[PDB]
Design a protein around this ligand. Structure first.
Ligand SMILES: CCCc1cc(=O)n2nc(NCc3ccc(-c4ccccc4)cc3)nc2[nH]1
Ligand SMILES: [Zn+2]
Length: 352
């Protein structure tokens, strides 16, 4: 049916809307960090990616785990695509006022992420002690810093570069929303800046393109009809589908944390699948609140087709396959397929 999914969705909203001092603990820590990074040569133009929002939650099950982004406006950037990866880039500068605020991190002509991250970490490490806050150092690149307030509160900090120039060539054929959100909206969205986060593909001074802000924007204005979800008549189940798929992967990832099979999968994989189903189903009538279950099943069916065909194109970079053999091995994909197919056929036990 579509009854139980609603109760999952009610439990999820009640935790989310519940009164907690958590966001206030987070707010004080980040405002203090931002004030200390600003009175420093390299990070004087630092700020929160989305102001007003400190309470950003990636894990839809964990109301105690926060994720924050620190954007840095980098003017006159030159990017070089690393090893034809389409999403991984070197950072160079057009060079006009040569003694630019980030010249101190230049390793030759290429901008060192590691050098920039070390200073960012060193500035934060020295401000935590000054404050109940403690930091942990975790590999990968970004999140750079991870903070722990009290016992349950956890905060991931990601350093990002902001570029107000045109999106790289690898995105040219991406964001295929023309028949859903319109060609007018695509051009507007693509006029918006883009972010680079420190990341590699297994170790160089590379940066991955990030479009968190586009995702947030589309989600808060997701209909073909401009009035979608504003009234009683136009209530769609798009966000509810996204939430249920996110919960599904989070529940399976917890259920199988002892084994390492679902370690490569994340919300990126679940978000990208949903957005591809949004393109496939552009009409609001295809997302009626009465069809929750049928709608959710088409999301689960598409994701299942992606795992099996080993194909999940990045929504912005269509040549980047999230499900490639070098990214995720067949063994890990087949383990996930079987786990979901059992969930589909047993009235999703994880959701109770
Ligand atoms: C709306 C669709 C979801 C979405 C949100 C967002 O914020 N972004 N930002 C990018 N940028 C390129 C990019 C390329 C690859 C990976 C990746 C992920 C996992 C494993 C291995 C690689 C992550 C980012 N794509 C997205 N898609
Ligand atoms: Zn809607």
């Amino acid at each position: 049916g579509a009854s139980k999914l609603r109760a999952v969705l009610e439990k999820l909203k009640l935790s989310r809307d519940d009164i907690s001092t958590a966001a206030g603990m987070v707010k004080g820590v980040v405002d203090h960090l931002l004030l200390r990074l600003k009175c420093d040569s390299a990070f004087r133009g630092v700020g929160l990616l989305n102001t007003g929002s400190y309470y950003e939650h990636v894990k839809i099950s964990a109301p105690n785990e926060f994720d924050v982004m620190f954007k840095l406006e980098v003017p006159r950037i030159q990017l070089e695509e690393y090893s034809n990866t389409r999403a991984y880039y070197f950072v160079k500068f057009k060079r006009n006022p040569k003694e630019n605020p980030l010249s101190q991190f230049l390793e030759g002509e290429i901008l060192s992420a590691s050098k920039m991250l070390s200073k960012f970490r060193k500035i934060i490490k020295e401000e935590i002690n000054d404050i109940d806050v403690i930091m942990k150092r975790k590999r990968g690149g970004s999140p750079a810093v991870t903070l722990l307030i009290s016992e349950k509160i956890s905060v991931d900090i990601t350093l990002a570069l902001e570029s107000k120039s045109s999106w790289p060539a690898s995105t040219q054929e991406g964001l295929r929303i023309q028949n859903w959100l319109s060609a007018k909206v695509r051009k507007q969205l693509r006029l918006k800046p883009f972010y680079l986060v420190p990341k590699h593909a297994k170790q160089e001074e590379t940066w991955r393109l990030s479009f968190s802000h586009i995702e947030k924007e589309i989600l808060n204005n997701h209909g073909k009809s401009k009035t979608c979800c504003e009234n009683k008549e136009e209530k769609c189940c798009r966000k509810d589908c996204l939430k249920l798929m996110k919960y599904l992967l989070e529940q399976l990832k917890e259920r199988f944390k002892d084994k390492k099979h679902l370690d490569k999968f994340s919300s990126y994989h679940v978000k990208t699948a949903f957005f591809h189903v949004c393109t496939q189903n552009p009409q609001d009538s295809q997302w009626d609140r009465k069809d929750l279950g049928l709608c959710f099943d088409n999301c689960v069916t598409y994701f299942l087709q992606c795992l099996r065909t080993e194909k999940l194109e990045n929504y912005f970079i269509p040549e980047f396959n999230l499900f490639s053999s070098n990214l995720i091995d067949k063994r890990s994909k087949e383990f996930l397929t079987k786990q979901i197919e059992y969930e589909r056929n047993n009235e999703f036990p994880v959701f109770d």
